Amino acid sequence: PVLNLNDPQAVERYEEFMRQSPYGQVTQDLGWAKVKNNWEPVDVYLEDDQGAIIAAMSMLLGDTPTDKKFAYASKGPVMDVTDVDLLDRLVDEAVKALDGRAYVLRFDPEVAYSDEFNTTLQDHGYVTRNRNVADAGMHATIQPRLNMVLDLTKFPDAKTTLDLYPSKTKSKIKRPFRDGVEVHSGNSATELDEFFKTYTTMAERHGITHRPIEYFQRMQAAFDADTMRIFVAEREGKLLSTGIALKYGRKIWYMYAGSMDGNTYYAPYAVQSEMIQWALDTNTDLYDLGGIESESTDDSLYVFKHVFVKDAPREYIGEIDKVLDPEVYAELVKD
């Protein structure tokens, strides 16, 4: 069935399923549609034999240079995607809800890549994009398939961030705090302003673009302080670096970051340590530092994230495409 966003009861039932599911993703929460307010939301779900929601998919429709829309369910659907028969049924509901307006329905769930799963998906008619597509550029996957994930369940008795690392790393983490760096956190307008200053400074330094502040304001309006938290690191009155983390489902996700020019006294390490501490304090299963371009010291992202994640990066199945308009798909999507 398709979710009626104007039915408060239906919305609450959908939200409760999403927030309580071990497969929950903040990008699949209805709040994400409020952040991506320039996209059109279409959400569907399936019920089990007792009428309870068993699977759901929050889609966002975007424009293309053609007459068709691009339907995307970021890090969805919310269910065990390896249960392909159930997946097919959920996608059928989604396809009906799309009513022929999109050329494709794409979803990139956080499930490990494997030849077996890749083949099963293809056998069911889906087109998958992973090892067969470019690593970067207009042809690469929207979300990085290689992600640095810290499995906190491997350390049941860990009390603080330091308890998860070898001595060599404990030293690196302690360094910023020893040098005066202090971190405060919250989700107020003040923290957002501090984040934005470091975020724009970072972008200017790298000569890259950045999202407007309104994007983050919608995010703050959509999620409470127990879901969204901004960490700000300072040293004796000077702003050094910040990071935004979202707690949802079984993980806390390091989503955005900013850092000022010059000497930052390893403040980014302090931010990470506090985000991890939040995961520990809330008994969260995973801490996700996000993607990397490659498992190589040549990649600055890897070098930094490898400090906090010694295990191999997780490699996801990638993009699963339900092709609806073959001609437009071939025009807009290539390896």
Next chain:
Amino acid sequence: XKXX
């Protein structure tokens, strides 16, 4: 620069 991408990413949610």
